């Protein structure tokens, strides 16, 4: 049996996070507006897609290793990271040692938000990268 063919809402697996407004953030931990995305598992039987193990990875933020770093360099925003949330509204763990099983649906729903890692956010460029693994039974 072939594995599922994997796609996001966007052809290139990208999510537009929108621009950073420093005024949105007045405390560490406060979030921006939700930006949903979805992981689709296509062209595969239910036997293959059931109880697939999903795990997220990426370069973790220094102040809050539970969120994605936006890096550092000129023009790049500071005191924000990108938090990922599951379909229960809960923060998705990243970069955990070598679990979480998904079943009942071939679309996996998530939300990304900017999360303040400092009381004083500065605007600018805020890109992030993550990867997820799909581990087949």
């Amino acid at each position: 049996a072939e594995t599922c063919r994997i796609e996001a809402g966007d052809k290139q697996m990208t999510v537009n996070m929108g621009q950073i407004s420093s005024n949105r953030f007045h405390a560490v931990g406060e979030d921006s507006a939700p930006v949903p995305f979805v992981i689709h598992l296509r062209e595969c039987s239910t036997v293959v897609s059931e109880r697939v193990g999903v795990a997220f990875h990426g370069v973790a933020d220094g102040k809050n290793p539970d969120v994605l770093s936006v890096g550092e360099g000129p023009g790049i925003a500071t005191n924000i990271g990108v938090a990922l949330f599951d379909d229960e509204g809960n923060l998705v763990p990243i970069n955990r040692p070598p679990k979480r099983l998904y079943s009942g649906s071939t679309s996996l729903h998530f939300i990304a938000k900017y999360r303040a890692t400092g009381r004083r956010v500065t605007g600018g460029i805020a890109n992030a990268q993550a990867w997820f693994s799909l581990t087949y039974q």
């Binding site: 370069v59 890096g71 990268q129 990867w131």
Partner: protein, 119 residues
Amino acid sequence: DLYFNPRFLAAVADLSRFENGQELPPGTYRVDIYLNNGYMATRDVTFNTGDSEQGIVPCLTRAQLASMGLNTASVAGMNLLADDACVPLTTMVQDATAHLDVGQQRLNLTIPQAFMSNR
């Protein structure tokens, strides 16, 4: 006109090759070697950066080509090369071709019969 985010990698010096449409970076690859559609061998072949459309070219020695049936005396200048020299196949052997099918990991060579072992 391609862009790949380098933060997904790291030797990301190979990224510009992919952004310019190349399939495979220089390296040593396990390939099936064919010559004039005859199966020759399956072994590791080193592919160095070169003047090919593919951006890489296989390193084939005089002895390795002779082992495939090449009549090396028939090829002008071939005798001048050093033993370990990568034969510039497509310029030294008239009308010869080399192409790596990356998806199959198959090196397809062609050499005119004039230069092969015959009669």
